[PDB]
C-alpha cells in the first residue's frame, strides 16, 4: 500500500516533465519562425542587384 | 559643319541615354558590372543575366 501511494509522486514528477517540454515547444514555435524570417532575410540579400540601402 | 555639330551632340546624348538606365543603383546596360544575379531557387543558386553595355 506504500508503494502504490508512493505513485502519486511519480505521476506529480512525470506531469512536470510534460509541462517543462510544453514551454520547450512554445519557444521553439517562436524560434523556428524567427529562424524562417532570417533566411529569408539572407536569402534576399545575396542578391547583387540590390543597393546598399536595401542590403 | 551643321552635319557634324548635329552628329557630335547625339553622340554626347547616347552618353547619357547609357549613363541614366539605371533602376534603384543597379544597371544592366550601363558598364558598371560584367553581369548581375537573381535568385532562382531558395537554396541561392543564382539567375545569371549577363550585362549589356550600352
Known sequence: SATAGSMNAVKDSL???????DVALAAGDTITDLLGKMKEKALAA??????TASF | NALKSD????????????????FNGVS?????????????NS????????????
Open chain 1, 46 to 51: 545575396s542578391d547583387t542587384s540590390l543597393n
Open chain 2, 43 to 54: 537554396d541561392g543558386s543564382a539567375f545569371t543575366v549577363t550585362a549589356k553595355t550600352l
Open chain 2, 7 to 22: 552628329f557630335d551632340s547625339l553622340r554626347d546624348q547616347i552618353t547619357k541615354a547609357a549613363s541614366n538606365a539605371k
Open chain 1, 15 to 21: 506531469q512536470r516533465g510534460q509541462s517543462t517540454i
Open chain 2, 28 to 40: 544592366i546596360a550601363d558598364g558598371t558590372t560584367t553581369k548581375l544575379s537573381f535568385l532562382a
